[PDB]
């Protein structure tokens, strides 16, 4: 019983390290997601204003 109490302690601490490990992994993944979302918000109004200038040349010339 002493051994198996220690073993249940061990399983509990393995769930602890699982919790912190997933915390760290997903927080770094959301950091990379923040970087690439900054990039996707960079790339939009440039495309739309180049479309506006497409309409410009498509009417005036």
């Amino acid at each position: 019983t002493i051994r198996n109490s220690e073993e249940l302690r061990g399983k509990a601490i393995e769930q602890l390290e699982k919790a912190r490990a997933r915390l760290k992994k997903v927080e770094m993944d959301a950091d990379q997601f923040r970087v690439n979302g900054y990039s996707e918000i960079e790339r939009e109004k440039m495309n739309l204003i180049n479309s506006t200038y497409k309409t410009l040349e498509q009417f005036e010339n």
């Binding site: 002493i2 509990a12 601490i13 602890l16 997601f33």
Partner: protein, 56 residues
């Protein structure tokens, strides 16, 4: 003699019971911590949705 025998019994009992109760407490800790983990994850990706909808 009663002190000595009850003492070693109390040693083993104390350590096993403390083991079990801390195990329950750290299980509560992981549940709460992963709840707040995925909640903050939803928050960050929701800030992404917000900046997308706003620039939109």
């Amino acid at each position: 003699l009663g002190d000595f025998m009850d003492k070693r019994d109390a040693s083993i009992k104390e350590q096993l019971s403390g083991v079990k109760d801390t195990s329950s407490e750290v299980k509560q800790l992981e549940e709460q911590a992963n709840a707040v983990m995925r909640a903050a994850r939803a928050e960050i990706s929701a800030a992404l949705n917000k900046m997308k909808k706003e620039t939109q």
